[PDB]
Amino acid sequence: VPQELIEKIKLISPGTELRKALDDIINANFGALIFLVDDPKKYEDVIQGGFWLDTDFSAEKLYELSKMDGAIVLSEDITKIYYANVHLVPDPTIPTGETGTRHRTAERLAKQTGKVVIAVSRRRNIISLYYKNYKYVVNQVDFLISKVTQAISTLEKYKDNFNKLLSELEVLELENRVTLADVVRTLAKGFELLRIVEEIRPYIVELGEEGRLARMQLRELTEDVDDLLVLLIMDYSSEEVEEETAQNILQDFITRREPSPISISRVLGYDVQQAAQLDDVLVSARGYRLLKTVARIPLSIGYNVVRMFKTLDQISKASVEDLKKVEGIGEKRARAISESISSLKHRKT
């Protein structure tokens, strides 16, 4: 959905006075055909008859005017009502796949002038917005809320399985018994989880102000998942990898590439052709995840720590004095690192 169309869709999203008027119109089963233009004079060839109003916009005014047949013309910023009861006459030769005089008119006029035209039939509860060559059907809140609520419920389920996988991976990581299969399984679940978020995004945007709670729920459920996934990529990829490369790996699996076991392992730098092989590849975390998340060690400085020790296992075998031999690590960083790892190994294993 082009950013261009997205901007127009906001004009009729829950929260706007315009949308408030369209909802009333739908609730009353009145129909509507609205043409948005800033300079009516320039479009006098497509606008016939009706009443010249040139008055300040209001949702109540639009609703009342919609009781009359014909079309209403508003300024593009929806601050002025120019005409009411007009006959819109776009070029008949313009191709259109719409049905009925009202929708065929709206599409042709939108294509012809490059402006927005809103159509609402009396029988249905949807709002059809035509811009240029785009057509976007806007749904009622009830339909959206239902879809969004089910998606959120679905996400809770994915997140729960994700936390179960992560907790088990945590134990293995601390015991240095991690296999490629363990990592791949955790990443795949994390990728699948973030995909759902991406897919439900448009519904939430279309919800406008009625999507505030939904946004809060999504944020609470996926708060630190992206970072966590990036750190897993950095900790288990075949060879050293930057936070940028990892972040890119994440974006690829959430959209383009499909999160399949082999595909994920392959992108991580492992040469595998069968899923069964995964349980045969032993891997060791570099330590980035634990250093940043638990030890609260900045990634930049973390590269230094991994530079010297290579793996979390070797980092947990170092002492305060030993750890301080790394640039950026003082008695404080050294303590945080050492104490945080030792504490986890005692509580988790």
Ligand X SMILES: Nc1ncnc2c1ncn2[C@@H]1O[C@@H]2COP(=O)(O)O[C@H]3[C@@H](O)[C@H](n4cnc5c(N)ncnc54)O[C@@H]3COP(=O)(O)O[C@H]2[C@H]1O
85 binds a copy of itself (CB under 8 A): yes
Q: Hey, how many other C-beta atoms are within 10 angstroms of the C-beta on 21?
A: 24
- Give 275-280 contacts, CB < 8 A, sequence gap 24+: 278/179, 278/180, 278/181, 278/184, 279/179, 279/180, 279/181, 280/179, 280/180
User: Quick one: which of 8, 46, 70, 272 contacts ligand X (CB under 6 A)?
Assistant: 70
Rounded to an integer, what distance in angstroms lies between the CA atom of residue 329 and that of residue 336? 10
In the chain, where does DSSP find H-type helix?
A: 3-9, 17-27, 59-65, 101-113, 141-174, 180-206, 212-222, 225-236, 243-254, 261-267, 288-293, 299-309, 312-315, 320-323, 331-348
Q: Binding to ligand X by residue 100, rule CB under 6 A?
A: yes
How far apart are CB 108 and ligand X at their closest, in Å? 9
78 three-class SS: coil
- Decide if residue 25 touches ligand X (CB under 6 A): no
CB of 52 to a copy of itself, least distance (A): 7
Q: Contact region for a copy of itself (CB under 8 A) — 62-70, 136-144, 230-238, 257-265?
A: 62-70
47 binds ligand X, rule: CB under 6 A:
no
Q: Under the criterion CB under 8 A, does residue 65 sit at the interface with a copy of itself? A: yes
- Our CA angle for 242, 246, 247, nearest 5°, is 115
Candidates 55, 79, 101, 342; binder of ligand X (CB under 6 A) is: 101
User: Applying CB under 8 A, does 156 fall inside the site for a copy of itself?
Assistant: no
In whole angstroms, give the CA distance from residue 282 to residue 22.
Answer: 60
Pull the structure tokens for residue 349: 């294993």
* Closer CB to a copy of itself, 5 or 59, in the complex: 59
In whole angstroms, how close is the CB of 65 to ligand X at the nearest point? 12
Per CB under 8 A, 252 contacts a copy of itself:
no
Q: Would you say 70 is a known binding-site residue? A: yes
Residues 282 and 179: beta-carbon distance below 8 Å: yes
Which one of 39-47, 101-109, 161-169, 304-312 is the stretch in contact with ligand X (CB under 6 A)? Answer: 101-109
The reply on whether position 88 binds ligand X by CB under 6 A is yes
Choose one: 64-72, 172-180, 232-240, 291-299; the region binding ligand X (CB under 6 A): 64-72
Region 21-60 residues binding a copy of itself, contact defined as CB under 8 A: 51-53, 55
Helix (H) or strand (E) holding 86: strand 80-88
Phi, psi of 117 (to 5 degrees): -135, 125
Please identify, using beta-carbon distances, which residue of 4 and 45 lies nearer to ligand X.
Answer: 45
96 binds ligand X per the rule CB under 6 A? no
Exactly one of 4, 69, 175, 327 binds a copy of itself (CB under 8 A); that residue is 69
Buried b (16+ CB within 10 A) or exposed e, 100-112: eebbbbbbbbbbb
Candidate list 18, 37, 71, 148; residue touching ligand X; CB under 6 A: 71
For residue 290, count other CB atoms closer than 10 A to its CB.
Answer: 24
Count of residues that interact with ligand X, criterion CB under 6 A? 11
Q: Which of 5, 68, 172, 294 binds a copy of itself (CB under 8 A)?
A: 68
| 108 in a known ligand binding site | no
Binding positions for ligand X, rule: CB under 6 A: 31, 33, 69-71, 87-88, 100-102, 105
